[PDB]
Swiss-Prot record:
It comes from Aquifex aeolicus (strain VF5). Catalyzes the reversible transfer of the terminal phosphate group between ATP and AMP. Plays an important role in cellular energy homeostasis and in adenine nucleotide metabolism. Keywords: ATP-binding, Cytoplasm, Kinase, Nucleotide biosynthesis, Nucleotide-binding, Transferase. This is Adenylate kinase. It is an enzyme of class 2 (transferase). The gene is adk. ATP binds at G10, A11, G12, K13, G14, T15, R120, R124, V133, Y134, K189. Pathway: Purine metabolism; AMP biosynthesis via salvage pathway; AMP from ADP: step 1/1. Residues 123-153 are annotated as: LID. InterPro entries: Adenyl_kin_sub, Adenylat/UMP-CMP_kin, Adenylat_kinase_CS, ADK_active_lid_dom_sf, P-loop_NTPase. GO terms for molecular function: adenylate kinase activity; ATP binding; nucleoside diphosphate kinase activity. Consists of three domains, a large central CORE domain and two small peripheral domains, NMPbind and LID, which undergo movements during catalysis. The LID domain closes over the site of phosphoryl transfer upon ATP binding. Assembling and dissambling the active center during each catalytic cycle provides an effective means to prevent ATP hydrolysis. Disulfide bonds: none annotated. Residues 30-59 are annotated as: NMP. It comes from the Bacteria.
Length: 203
């Protein structure tokens, strides 16, 4: 089974993907996580990607498409989390999978309104030792635990990211809907409720 998690930044896609991977044994492919590691390690990919990410822009398609070929597993069910983000990326994924006799089985669209997006992202915090994601209101870090705020979770970058999402990524809704594989998730609900809907949708 191959899943794609699609939707505005802050919808809770990462959070749900991590849970589903941990509990059901999917391979979680987070382009954001992988890129952040690349930036940290100072790889050719990292150095090139860094500025796009800090500015809230998408990293160029060719780099991401290569990244996906590099990390796609020989076996296992997969969650694509934050990929694809453009039509060109979605077409390259279809091609890549077709060559492997595979296809996207479900595209879960995590719907949230802008107000919730801003609230979720502005409050997002990361434990730098473990990568665990918290929220200052909805899931605060344990007392005493040091966390950081991502530079792209600052207000003006969130604004850019949402524009970029609406411009480049939202067309994917129609792209996948035509194929009859688009599943709507009400991502504005609490985490446990969203996860139950994720499980129902994928059977
Ligand atoms: N599939 C992709 N294509 C291009 N850029 C990406 C992709 N995935 C992640 N990025 C880059 O990394 C940034 C953070 O992505 P991600 O962690 O997936 O976003 P979010 O903040 O919604 O969790 C994006 O704004 C973009 O610069
Ligand atoms: N269902 C939810 N209700 C409340 N807060 C949430 C929910 N899902 C995620 N969060 C919090 O909102 C922020 C965005 O979640 P994340 O999974 O990073 O989103 P995405 O991967 O879609 O950008 C994080 O701070 C996370 O702890």
């Amino acid at each position: 089974m191959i899943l794609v998690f699609l939707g505005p930044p802050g919808a809770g896609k990462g959070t749900q993907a991590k849970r589903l991977a941990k509990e059901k044994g999917f391979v979680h492919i987070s382009t954001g996580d992988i890129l952040r590691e690349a930036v940290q390690k100072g790889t050719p990919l990292g150095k090139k990607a860094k500025e796009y990410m800090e500015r809230g822009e998408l990293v160029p398609d060719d780099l991401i498409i290569a990244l996906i070929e590099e990390v796609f597993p020989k076996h296992g069910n997969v969650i694509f989390d934050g990929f694809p983000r453009t039509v060109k990326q979605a077409e390259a994924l279809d091609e890549m999978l077709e060559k492997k006799g595979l296809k996207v089985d479900h595209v879960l669209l995590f719907e949230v309104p802008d107000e919730v997006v801003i609230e979720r992202l502005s409050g997002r915090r990361i434990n730098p030792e473990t990568g665990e994601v918290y929220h200052v209101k909805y899931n605060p870090p344990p007392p005493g635990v040091k966390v950081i705020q991502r530079e792209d979770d600052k207000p003006e970058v969130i604004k850019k990211r949402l524009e970029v999402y609406r411009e480049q990524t939202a067309p994917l809704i129609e792209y996948y809907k035509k194929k009859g594989i688009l599943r709507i998730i009400d991502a504005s609900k609490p985490v446990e409720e969203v996860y139950r809907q994720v499980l129902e949708v994928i059977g």
